[PDB]
Amino acid sequence: TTHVTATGSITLHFSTSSPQANFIVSLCGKKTTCNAECKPPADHIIGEP
Amino acid sequence: PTILEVSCTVADCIYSADFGGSLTLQYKANREGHCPVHSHSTTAVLKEA
């Protein structure tokens, strides 16, 4: 949940498994298609699942 | 602060060893901050970062 104003912007974080972010984000029902291109990770091991 | 969009207008410049070129950036951002600036070309460097 993000506090939404009449007009403005919001920055968000996300995690993906796909090499490209080609996924629909919905905001209060309104749908928009994000097109992106995610690089391979620089690390090799993480302490998170 | 992420910036919504940026446009570049370059003034007079002379290719030399000193910082002889100048430009202006029109920026739109979402918060007041201390963004870094870089030049991604091999043949151009910035006095301010």
Side-chain angles (χ1 to χ4, degrees):
Chain A
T1 83
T2 78
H3 187 344
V4 72
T5 66
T7 56
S9 271
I10 181 61
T11 284
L12 289 182
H13 311 287
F14 80 98
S15 159
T16 174
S17 155
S18 57
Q20 61 210 337
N22 225 321
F23 72 108
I24 300 177
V25 185
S26 98
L27 208 184
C28 261
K30 192 63 60 59
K31 279 183 224 185
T32 71
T33 299
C34 294
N35 265 292
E37 193 75 329
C38 302
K39 270 162 281 278
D43 267 1
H44 296 324
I45 304 290
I46 318 164
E48 266 204 340
Chain B
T2 181
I3 71 196
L4 271 44
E5 88 277 14
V6 276
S7 82
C8 164
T9 85
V10 186
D12 45 10
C13 58
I14 58 184
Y15 58 94
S16 169
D18 47 15
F19 293 153
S22 167
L23 63 142
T24 85
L25 294 183
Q26 271 271 59
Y27 54 81
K28 230 155 188 298
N30 292 336
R31 225 187 310 100
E32 304 217 73
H34 267 296
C35 266
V37 193
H38 191 228
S39 60
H40 293 4
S41 181
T42 304
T43 83
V45 313
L46 270 44
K47 185 167 105 171
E48 291 85 358

Coordinates of all heavy atoms in Angstrom, one line a residue:
Chain A
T1 N 0.8 -1.2 0.0 CA 0.0 0.0 0.0 C 0.9 1.2 0.0 O 1.8 1.4 0.8 CB -0.9 0.0 1.2 OG1 -0.2 0.5 2.3 CG2 -1.4 -1.4 1.5
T2 N 0.6 2.2 -0.9 CA 1.3 3.4 -1.0 C 0.3 4.6 -0.8 O -0.8 4.5 -1.4 CB 2.0 3.6 -2.4 OG1 1.1 4.0 -3.3 CG2 2.6 2.3 -2.8
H3 N 0.7 5.6 -0.1 CA -0.1 6.8 0.0 C -0.1 7.4 -1.4 O 0.9 7.8 -1.9 CB 0.4 7.7 1.1 CG -0.5 8.9 1.3 ND1 -1.5 9.3 0.5 CD2 -0.5 9.7 2.4 CE1 -2.1 10.3 1.0 NE2 -1.5 10.6 2.1
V4 N -1.3 7.5 -2.0 CA -1.5 8.1 -3.3 C -2.1 9.5 -3.2 O -3.0 9.7 -2.3 CB -2.4 7.2 -4.2 CG1 -3.8 7.2 -3.7 CG2 -2.3 7.5 -5.6
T5 N -1.6 10.4 -4.0 CA -2.1 11.8 -4.0 C -2.9 12.0 -5.3 O -3.2 11.0 -6.0 CB -0.9 12.8 -4.0 OG1 -0.2 12.6 -5.2 CG2 0.0 12.5 -2.8
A6 N -3.3 13.2 -5.5 CA -4.0 13.5 -6.7 C -3.2 13.3 -7.9 O -3.6 12.6 -8.9 CB -4.5 15.0 -6.7
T7 N -1.9 13.8 -7.9 CA -1.0 13.6 -9.0 C 0.4 13.5 -8.4 O 0.8 14.3 -7.5 CB -1.0 14.7 -10.1 OG1 -0.8 15.9 -9.5 CG2 -2.3 14.6 -10.8
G8 N 1.2 12.6 -8.9 CA 2.6 12.5 -8.5 C 3.3 11.2 -9.0 O 2.9 10.7 -10.1
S9 N 4.2 10.7 -8.2 CA 4.9 9.5 -8.6 C 5.2 8.7 -7.4 O 5.3 9.2 -6.3 CB 6.2 9.9 -9.4 OG 6.0 10.0 -10.7
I10 N 5.4 7.4 -7.6 CA 5.9 6.5 -6.6 C 7.0 5.6 -7.2 O 6.9 5.1 -8.3 CB 4.7 5.6 -6.1 CG1 5.2 4.7 -5.0 CG2 4.1 4.8 -7.2 CD1 5.8 5.4 -3.8
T11 N 8.1 5.4 -6.4 CA 9.1 4.5 -6.7 C 8.9 3.2 -5.9 O 8.5 3.3 -4.7 CB 10.5 5.1 -6.4 OG1 10.9 6.0 -7.4 CG2 11.5 4.0 -6.3
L12 N 9.1 2.1 -6.6 CA 8.8 0.8 -5.9 C 10.0 -0.2 -6.1 O 10.8 0.0 -7.1 CB 7.6 0.1 -6.4 CG 6.3 0.9 -5.9 CD1 5.1 0.1 -6.4 CD2 6.4 0.9 -4.4
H13 N 10.1 -1.2 -5.3 CA 11.1 -2.2 -5.5 C 10.4 -3.5 -5.8 O 9.3 -3.7 -5.4 CB 12.0 -2.4 -4.2 CG 12.5 -1.2 -3.7 ND1 13.6 -0.5 -4.3 CD2 12.2 -0.5 -2.5 CE1 13.9 0.5 -3.5 NE2 13.1 0.6 -2.5
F14 N 11.1 -4.4 -6.5 CA 10.6 -5.7 -6.9 C 11.7 -6.7 -7.1 O 12.8 -6.3 -7.3 CB 9.7 -5.5 -8.2 CG 10.5 -5.5 -9.4 CD1 10.7 -6.6 -10.2 CD2 11.1 -4.3 -9.8 CE1 11.4 -6.5 -11.4 CE2 11.8 -4.2 -11.0 CZ 12.0 -5.3 -11.7
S15 N 11.3 -7.9 -7.0 CA 12.2 -9.0 -7.4 C 11.5 -9.9 -8.5 O 10.3 -10.1 -8.4 CB 12.5 -9.9 -6.2 OG 13.0 -11.2 -6.7
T16 N 12.3 -10.3 -9.4 CA 11.9 -11.2 -10.5 C 12.8 -12.4 -10.7 O 14.0 -12.3 -10.3 CB 11.8 -10.4 -11.9 OG1 11.5 -11.4 -12.9 CG2 13.1 -9.8 -12.2
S17 N 12.3 -13.4 -11.3 CA 13.1 -14.5 -11.7 C 13.4 -14.5 -13.2 O 14.3 -15.3 -13.7 CB 12.4 -15.8 -11.3 OG 12.8 -16.9 -12.2
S18 N 12.7 -13.8 -13.9 CA 12.8 -13.8 -15.4 C 13.9 -12.9 -15.9 O 14.2 -11.9 -15.3 CB 11.5 -13.4 -16.0 OG 11.1 -12.1 -15.6
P19 N 14.5 -13.3 -17.0 CA 15.5 -12.4 -17.5 C 15.0 -11.1 -18.0 O 15.7 -10.1 -18.1 CB 16.1 -13.2 -18.7 CG 15.0 -14.1 -19.1 CD 14.3 -14.5 -17.8
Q20 N 13.7 -11.0 -18.4 CA 13.1 -9.8 -18.8 C 11.9 -9.5 -17.9 O 11.1 -10.5 -17.6 CB 12.7 -9.8 -20.2 CG 11.7 -10.8 -20.7 CD 12.0 -11.2 -22.1 OE1 12.5 -10.5 -22.9 NE2 11.5 -12.4 -22.5
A21 N 11.7 -8.3 -17.4 CA 10.5 -7.9 -16.7 C 9.5 -7.5 -17.8 O 9.5 -6.4 -18.4 CB 10.7 -6.8 -15.7
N22 N 8.5 -8.4 -18.0 CA 7.5 -8.2 -19.1 C 6.1 -8.4 -18.5 O 5.3 -9.2 -19.0 CB 7.7 -9.2 -20.2 CG 7.6 -8.5 -21.6 OD1 6.7 -7.7 -21.8 ND2 8.4 -8.9 -22.5
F23 N 5.9 -7.8 -17.4 CA 4.8 -8.1 -16.5 C 3.9 -6.9 -16.2 O 4.4 -5.8 -16.2 CB 5.4 -8.6 -15.2 CG 6.0 -7.6 -14.3 CD1 5.4 -7.2 -13.2 CD2 7.2 -7.0 -14.7 CE1 5.9 -6.2 -12.4 CE2 7.7 -6.0 -13.9 CZ 7.1 -5.6 -12.8
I24 N 2.7 -7.2 -15.9 CA 1.6 -6.2 -15.7 C 1.6 -5.8 -14.3 O 1.4 -6.7 -13.4 CB 0.3 -6.7 -16.2 CG1 0.3 -7.1 -17.7 CG2 -0.8 -5.7 -15.9 CD1 -0.9 -7.7 -18.2
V25 N 1.7 -4.5 -14.0 CA 1.5 -4.0 -12.7 C 0.1 -3.3 -12.7 O -0.3 -2.6 -13.6 CB 2.5 -2.9 -12.4 CG1 2.3 -2.4 -10.9 CG2 3.9 -3.5 -12.6
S26 N -0.6 -3.6 -11.6 CA -1.9 -3.0 -11.4 C -1.9 -2.1 -10.2 O -1.3 -2.3 -9.2 CB -3.0 -4.1 -11.1 OG -3.2 -4.3 -9.7
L27 N -2.6 -0.9 -10.4 CA -2.7 0.1 -9.3 C -4.2 0.4 -9.2 O -4.8 1.0 -10.1 CB -1.9 1.3 -9.6 CG -1.3 2.2 -8.5 CD1 -0.6 3.4 -9.1 CD2 -2.4 2.6 -7.6
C28 N -4.7 0.0 -8.0 CA -6.2 0.2 -7.8 C -7.0 -0.2 -9.0 O -8.0 0.5 -9.4 CB -6.4 1.7 -7.4 SG -6.6 2.0 -5.7
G29 N -6.6 -1.3 -9.6 CA -7.4 -1.9 -10.7 C -6.8 -1.5 -12.1 O -7.0 -2.2 -13.0
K30 N -6.3 -0.3 -12.2 CA -5.7 0.1 -13.5 C -4.4 -0.7 -13.8 O -3.6 -0.9 -13.0 CB -5.3 1.6 -13.5 CG -5.0 2.2 -14.9 CD -6.2 2.1 -15.8 CE -7.4 2.9 -15.2 NZ -7.0 4.3 -15.0
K31 N -4.4 -1.2 -15.0 CA -3.3 -2.1 -15.5 C -2.4 -1.3 -16.5 O -2.9 -0.7 -17.4 CB -3.9 -3.3 -16.2 CG -4.4 -4.4 -15.2 CD -4.9 -5.6 -15.9 CE -6.2 -6.1 -15.3 NZ -6.7 -7.3 -16.0
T32 N -1.1 -1.5 -16.3 CA -0.1 -1.0 -17.2 C 1.0 -2.1 -17.4 O 1.5 -2.7 -16.4 CB 0.5 0.3 -16.8 OG1 1.4 0.1 -15.7 CG2 -0.5 1.3 -16.5
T33 N 1.4 -2.3 -18.6 CA 2.5 -3.2 -18.9 C 3.9 -2.6 -18.8 O 4.2 -1.7 -19.5 CB 2.3 -3.8 -20.3 OG1 1.1 -4.5 -20.4 CG2 3.5 -4.7 -20.7
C34 N 4.7 -3.1 -17.9 CA 6.1 -2.7 -17.8 C 6.9 -3.6 -18.7 O 6.8 -4.8 -18.7 CB 6.6 -2.9 -16.3 SG 5.9 -1.9 -15.1
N35 N 7.7 -3.0 -19.5 CA 8.7 -3.7 -20.3 C 10.1 -3.3 -19.8 O 10.5 -2.2 -19.8 CB 8.6 -3.3 -21.8 CG 7.7 -4.2 -22.6 OD1 8.1 -5.4 -22.8 ND2 6.6 -3.7 -23.0
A36 N 10.9 -4.4 -19.5 CA 12.2 -4.2 -19.0 C 13.2 -5.3 -19.5 O 12.8 -6.1 -20.3 CB 12.2 -4.2 -17.4
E37 N 14.4 -5.2 -19.0 CA 15.4 -6.2 -19.4 C 16.4 -6.4 -18.3 O 17.3 -5.5 -18.1 CB 16.2 -5.7 -20.7 CG 17.0 -6.7 -21.3 CD 16.2 -7.8 -22.1 OE1 15.1 -8.1 -21.7 OE2 16.8 -8.2 -23.1
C38 N 16.3 -7.4 -17.5 CA 17.0 -7.6 -16.3 C 18.3 -8.3 -16.6 O 18.3 -9.3 -17.3 CB 16.2 -8.4 -15.2 SG 14.6 -7.6 -14.8
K39 N 19.4 -7.8 -16.0 CA 20.7 -8.5 -16.2 C 20.9 -9.7 -15.3 O 20.1 -9.9 -14.4 CB 21.8 -7.5 -16.0 CG 22.2 -6.7 -17.3 CD 22.9 -5.4 -16.9 CE 22.0 -4.3 -16.4 NZ 21.4 -3.6 -17.6
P40 N 21.9 -10.6 -15.6 CA 22.2 -11.6 -14.7 C 22.8 -11.1 -13.4 O 23.5 -10.0 -13.5 CB 23.2 -12.5 -15.5 CG 23.7 -11.6 -16.6 CD 22.6 -10.6 -16.9
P41 N 22.6 -11.7 -12.3 CA 23.1 -11.2 -11.0 C 24.6 -11.3 -11.0 O 25.3 -12.1 -11.6 CB 22.5 -12.1 -10.0 CG 22.1 -13.3 -10.7 CD 21.9 -13.0 -12.2
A42 N 25.2 -10.3 -10.3 CA 26.7 -10.2 -10.2 C 27.2 -11.2 -9.1 O 28.3 -11.7 -9.3 CB 27.1 -8.8 -9.8
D43 N 26.5 -11.5 -8.1 CA 26.9 -12.4 -7.1 C 26.8 -13.8 -7.6 O 26.6 -14.1 -8.8 CB 26.0 -12.3 -5.8 CG 26.6 -11.4 -4.8 OD1 27.7 -10.8 -5.1 OD2 26.1 -11.2 -3.7
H44 N 27.1 -14.8 -6.7 CA 26.9 -16.2 -7.0 C 26.1 -16.9 -5.9 O 25.3 -17.8 -6.2 CB 28.2 -17.0 -7.2 CG 28.9 -16.6 -8.4 ND1 28.3 -16.1 -9.6 CD2 30.3 -16.5 -8.7 CE1 29.3 -15.8 -10.5 NE2 30.4 -16.0 -9.9
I45 N 26.1 -16.4 -4.7 CA 25.5 -17.0 -3.6 C 24.8 -15.9 -2.7 O 25.3 -14.8 -2.6 CB 26.5 -17.8 -2.7 CG1 27.2 -18.8 -3.6 CG2 25.7 -18.5 -1.6 CD1 26.2 -19.9 -4.1
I46 N 23.7 -16.3 -2.1 CA 22.9 -15.4 -1.3 C 22.5 -16.1 0.0 O 22.5 -17.3 0.0 CB 21.6 -14.9 -2.0 CG1 21.9 -14.6 -3.5 CG2 21.0 -13.7 -1.3 CD1 20.7 -14.5 -4.3
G47 N 22.3 -15.3 1.0 CA 21.8 -15.8 2.3 C 20.3 -15.7 2.3 O 19.7 -15.7 3.4
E48 N 19.6 -15.6 1.2 CA 18.1 -15.6 1.2 C 17.6 -16.7 0.3 O 18.3 -17.0 -0.7 CB 17.6 -14.2 0.7 CG 17.3 -13.2 1.8 CD 16.3 -12.2 1.3 OE1 16.1 -12.0 0.1 OE2 15.6 -11.5 2.1
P49 N 16.5 -17.2 0.5 CA 15.9 -18.2 -0.4 C 15.2 -17.4 -1.5 O 14.8 -16.2 -1.4 CB 14.8 -18.9 0.4 CG 14.4 -17.9 1.4 CD 15.7 -17.1 1.8
Chain B
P1 N 16.4 10.5 -4.9 CA 15.4 10.9 -5.8 C 15.6 10.4 -7.2 O 16.6 10.8 -7.8 CB 15.3 12.4 -5.7 CG 16.4 12.8 -4.8 CD 17.3 11.6 -4.5
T2 N 14.8 9.5 -7.7 CA 14.7 9.3 -9.2 C 14.2 10.5 -9.9 O 13.4 11.3 -9.4 CB 13.9 8.1 -9.5 OG1 13.8 7.8 -10.9 CG2 12.4 8.3 -9.0
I3 N 14.7 10.6 -11.2 CA 14.3 11.7 -12.0 C 13.4 11.2 -13.1 O 13.6 10.2 -13.7 CB 15.5 12.4 -12.6 CG1 16.2 11.6 -13.6 CG2 16.5 12.8 -11.5 CD1 17.6 12.0 -14.0
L4 N 12.3 11.9 -13.4 CA 11.3 11.5 -14.4 C 11.9 11.6 -15.8 O 11.9 10.7 -16.6 CB 10.0 12.3 -14.3 CG 9.0 11.7 -13.4 CD1 9.5 11.2 -12.1 CD2 7.8 12.7 -13.2
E5 N 12.5 12.8 -16.2 CA 13.1 12.9 -17.5 C 14.1 14.0 -17.5 O 14.1 14.9 -16.6 CB 12.1 13.2 -18.6 CG 11.8 14.7 -18.7 CD 10.8 15.2 -17.7 OE1 10.5 14.5 -16.8 OE2 10.3 16.3 -17.9
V6 N 15.1 13.9 -18.4 CA 16.2 14.9 -18.5 C 16.4 15.2 -20.0 O 16.4 14.3 -20.9 CB 17.5 14.3 -17.9 CG1 17.4 14.6 -16.4 CG2 17.5 12.8 -18.1
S7 N 16.7 16.4 -20.3 CA 17.0 16.8 -21.7 C 18.3 17.6 -21.6 O 18.6 18.4 -20.6 CB 16.0 17.7 -22.3 OG 16.0 19.0 -21.9
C8 N 19.2 17.5 -22.6 CA 20.5 18.1 -22.6 C 20.6 19.2 -23.7 O 20.1 19.0 -24.8 CB 21.6 17.0 -22.9 SG 23.1 17.6 -23.4
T9 N 21.2 20.3 -23.3 CA 21.5 21.4 -24.2 C 22.9 21.8 -24.0 O 23.3 22.3 -23.0 CB 20.6 22.6 -24.0 OG1 21.1 23.4 -23.0 CG2 19.2 22.2 -23.6
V10 N 23.7 21.6 -25.1 CA 25.2 21.8 -25.0 C 25.5 23.2 -25.5 O 25.1 23.6 -26.6 CB 25.9 20.8 -25.8 CG1 27.4 21.0 -25.6 CG2 25.5 19.4 -25.3
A11 N 26.2 24.0 -24.8 CA 26.7 25.3 -25.2 C 27.9 25.1 -26.1 O 28.1 24.0 -26.6 CB 27.0 26.2 -24.0
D12 N 28.6 26.2 -26.4 CA 29.9 26.2 -27.1 C 30.9 25.3 -26.3 O 30.9 25.3 -25.1 CB 30.4 27.6 -27.2 CG 30.3 28.4 -25.9 OD1 30.0 27.8 -24.9 OD2 30.6 29.6 -25.9
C13 N 31.7 24.6 -27.1 CA 32.7 23.7 -26.6 C 33.9 23.7 -27.5 O 33.8 23.9 -28.7 CB 32.2 22.3 -26.4 SG 31.5 21.6 -27.9
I14 N 35.1 23.5 -26.9 CA 36.3 23.3 -27.6 C 37.0 22.1 -27.1 O 37.2 22.0 -25.9 CB 37.2 24.5 -27.6 CG1 37.6 24.9 -26.2 CG2 36.6 25.7 -28.4 CD1 38.4 26.2 -26.1
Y15 N 37.4 21.2 -28.0 CA 38.1 20.0 -27.6 C 39.5 20.3 -27.2 O 40.3 20.8 -28.0 CB 38.0 18.9 -28.7 CG 38.6 19.3 -30.0 CD1 39.9 19.0 -30.4 CD2 37.7 19.9 -30.9 CE1 40.3 19.4 -31.6 CE2 38.2 20.3 -32.2 CZ 39.5 20.0 -32.5 OH 40.0 20.4 -33.7
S16 N 39.9 20.1 -26.0 CA 41.2 20.5 -25.4 C 41.5 19.7 -24.2 O 40.7 18.8 -23.8 CB 41.2 22.0 -25.1 OG 42.4 22.3 -24.4
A17 N 42.6 20.0 -23.5 CA 42.9 19.3 -22.3 C 42.1 19.9 -21.1 O 41.7 19.2 -20.2 CB 44.4 19.3 -22.0
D18 N 42.0 21.2 -21.1 CA 41.2 21.8 -20.0 C 39.7 21.6 -20.2 O 39.3 21.1 -21.3 CB 41.4 23.3 -20.0 CG 41.4 23.9 -21.4 OD1 40.9 23.2 -22.3 OD2 41.8 25.1 -21.6
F19 N 38.9 21.8 -19.2 CA 37.5 21.7 -19.2 C 36.8 22.8 -20.0 O 36.2 23.8 -19.5 CB 36.9 21.7 -17.8 CG 37.3 20.5 -16.9 CD1 37.4 20.6 -15.6 CD2 37.6 19.3 -17.5 CE1 37.8 19.6 -14.8 CE2 38.0 18.3 -16.8 CZ 38.1 18.4 -15.4
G20 N 37.0 22.8 -21.3 CA 36.6 23.9 -22.1 C 35.2 23.8 -22.7 O 34.7 24.8 -23.2
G21 N 34.5 22.7 -22.5 CA 33.1 22.6 -22.9 C 32.1 22.8 -21.8 O 32.4 22.5 -20.6
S22 N 30.9 23.2 -22.1 CA 29.8 23.4 -21.2 C 28.5 22.9 -21.7 O 28.3 23.0 -22.9 CB 29.7 24.9 -20.8 OG 28.5 25.1 -20.1
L23 N 27.6 22.5 -20.8 CA 26.3 22.1 -21.2 C 25.3 22.4 -20.0 O 25.7 22.7 -18.9 CB 26.2 20.7 -21.6 CG 26.5 19.7 -20.4 CD1 25.6 18.5 -20.5 CD2 28.0 19.3 -20.6
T24 N 24.0 22.3 -20.3 CA 22.9 22.5 -19.4 C 22.0 21.3 -19.4 O 21.7 20.8 -20.5 CB 22.1 23.7 -19.7 OG1 21.2 23.4 -20.7 CG2 23.0 24.8 -20.2
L25 N 21.6 20.8 -18.3 CA 20.6 19.7 -18.1 C 19.3 20.3 -17.6 O 19.3 20.9 -16.5 CB 21.1 18.6 -17.3 CG 22.3 17.9 -17.9 CD1 22.7 16.7 -17.1 CD2 21.9 17.4 -19.3
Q26 N 18.2 20.1 -18.3 CA 16.8 20.3 -17.8 C 16.4 19.0 -17.1 O 16.2 18.0 -17.8 CB 15.9 20.7 -18.9 CG 15.8 22.2 -19.1 CD 14.8 22.8 -18.3 OE1 14.8 22.7 -17.0 NE2 13.8 23.4 -18.9
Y27 N 16.1 19.0 -15.8 CA 15.8 17.8 -15.1 C 14.4 18.0 -14.4 O 14.0 19.1 -14.0 CB 16.8 17.5 -14.1 CG 17.1 18.6 -13.1 CD1 16.2 18.9 -12.1 CD2 18.2 19.4 -13.3 CE1 16.5 19.9 -11.2 CE2 18.4 20.5 -12.5 CZ 17.6 20.7 -11.4 OH 17.9 21.8 -10.6
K28 N 13.7 16.8 -14.4 CA 12.5 16.7 -13.5 C 12.7 15.6 -12.6 O 13.0 14.4 -13.0 CB 11.3 16.5 -14.4 CG 10.1 17.4 -14.1 CD 9.2 17.6 -15.3 CE 8.2 18.6 -15.1 NZ 7.3 18.3 -13.9
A29 N 12.5 15.8 -11.3 CA 12.8 14.8 -10.3 C 11.6 14.7 -9.3 O 10.6 15.5 -9.4 CB 14.1 15.1 -9.5
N30 N 11.7 13.8 -8.3 CA 10.6 13.6 -7.4 C 11.0 14.0 -5.9 O 10.1 14.1 -5.1 CB 10.2 12.2 -7.3 CG 9.5 11.7 -8.6 OD1 9.0 12.6 -9.3 ND2 9.6 10.5 -8.9
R31 N 12.2 14.3 -5.6 CA 12.6 14.7 -4.3 C 13.9 15.5 -4.4 O 14.6 15.4 -5.4 CB 12.7 13.5 -3.3 CG 12.0 13.8 -2.0 CD 12.3 12.7 -1.0 NE 12.1 11.4 -1.5 CZ 13.0 10.6 -1.9 NH1 14.3 10.9 -1.9 NH2 12.7 9.3 -2.4
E32 N 14.2 16.3 -3.4 CA 15.4 17.1 -3.4 C 16.5 16.2 -2.8 O 16.4 15.7 -1.7 CB 15.2 18.3 -2.6 CG 14.1 19.2 -3.0 CD 14.4 20.7 -2.9 OE1 15.2 21.2 -3.8 OE2 13.9 21.3 -2.0
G33 N 17.6 16.1 -3.6 CA 18.7 15.2 -3.2 C 20.0 15.5 -3.8 O 20.3 16.6 -4.1
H34 N 20.9 14.5 -3.8 CA 22.3 14.7 -4.2 C 22.7 13.6 -5.3 O 23.6 12.8 -5.0 CB 23.2 14.7 -3.0 CG 23.5 16.0 -2.5 ND1 24.1 17.0 -3.2 CD2 23.1 16.6 -1.3 CE1 24.2 18.1 -2.5 NE2 23.6 17.9 -1.3
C35 N 22.0 13.7 -6.4 CA 22.2 12.6 -7.4 C 23.6 12.7 -7.9 O 24.2 13.8 -8.0 CB 21.2 12.8 -8.6 SG 19.7 11.8 -8.5
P36 N 24.2 11.6 -8.3 CA 25.5 11.6 -9.0 C 25.3 11.8 -10.5 O 24.3 11.5 -11.0 CB 26.1 10.3 -8.7 CG 24.9 9.4 -8.2 CD 23.7 10.3 -8.2
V37 N 26.3 12.4 -11.1 CA 26.4 12.6 -12.5 C 27.6 12.0 -13.1 O 28.7 12.1 -12.6 CB 26.4 14.1 -12.9 CG1 26.1 14.3 -14.3 CG2 25.3 14.8 -12.0
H38 N 27.4 11.3 -14.3 CA 28.5 10.7 -14.9 C 28.4 10.8 -16.4 O 27.3 11.0 -17.0 CB 28.6 9.2 -14.6 CG 29.9 8.6 -15.1 ND1 29.9 7.4 -15.7 CD2 31.2 9.0 -15.0 CE1 31.2 7.1 -16.0 NE2 32.0 8.0 -15.6
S39 N 29.5 10.6 -17.1 CA 29.5 10.5 -18.6 C 29.9 9.1 -19.0 O 31.0 8.6 -18.6 CB 30.5 11.5 -19.2 OG 31.8 11.3 -18.7
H40 N 29.0 8.4 -19.7 CA 29.3 7.0 -20.0 C 30.1 6.8 -21.3 O 30.4 5.7 -21.6 CB 27.9 6.3 -20.2 CG 27.1 6.1 -19.0 ND1 27.5 6.7 -17.8 CD2 26.0 5.5 -18.7 CE1 26.6 6.4 -16.8 NE2 25.7 5.7 -17.4
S41 N 30.5 7.9 -21.9 CA 31.4 7.8 -23.1 C 32.8 7.7 -22.7 O 33.2 8.1 -21.6 CB 31.2 8.9 -24.0 OG 32.1 8.8 -25.2
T42 N 33.6 7.0 -23.5 CA 35.0 7.0 -23.2 C 35.7 8.3 -23.5 O 36.7 8.6 -22.8 CB 35.7 5.9 -24.1 OG1 35.1 4.7 -23.9 CG2 37.2 5.8 -23.8
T43 N 35.2 9.2 -24.4 CA 35.8 10.4 -24.8 C 35.3 11.6 -24.1 O 35.3 12.7 -24.8 CB 35.8 10.5 -26.3 OG1 34.5 11.1 -26.7 CG2 35.9 9.1 -26.9
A44 N 34.8 11.6 -22.9 CA 34.2 12.7 -22.3 C 34.2 12.5 -20.8 O 33.8 11.4 -20.3 CB 32.8 13.0 -22.8
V45 N 34.6 13.5 -20.0 CA 34.7 13.4 -18.6 C 34.1 14.7 -18.0 O 34.2 15.8 -18.6 CB 36.1 13.1 -18.0 CG1 36.7 12.0 -18.8 CG2 36.9 14.4 -18.1
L46 N 33.6 14.6 -16.8 CA 32.9 15.7 -16.2 C 33.7 16.3 -15.0 O 34.3 15.5 -14.2 CB 31.6 15.3 -15.7 CG 30.4 15.4 -16.7 CD1 30.8 14.9 -18.0 CD2 29.2 14.6 -16.2
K47 N 33.7 17.6 -14.8 CA 34.3 18.2 -13.7 C 33.6 17.9 -12.4 O 34.2 17.5 -11.4 CB 34.5 19.7 -13.8 CG 35.2 20.4 -12.7 CD 35.6 21.8 -13.0 CE 34.7 22.8 -12.3 NZ 35.1 24.2 -12.4
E48 N 32.3 18.0 -12.4 CA 31.4 17.7 -11.3 C 30.9 16.3 -11.4 O 30.7 15.8 -12.5 CB 30.3 18.7 -11.2 CG 30.7 20.0 -10.9 CD 31.1 20.8 -12.1 OE1 31.1 20.2 -13.2 OE2 31.5 22.0 -11.9
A49 N 30.9 15.6 -10.2 CA 30.3 14.3 -10.2 C 29.0 14.2 -9.4 O 28.3 13.2 -9.5 CB 31.3 13.3 -9.7

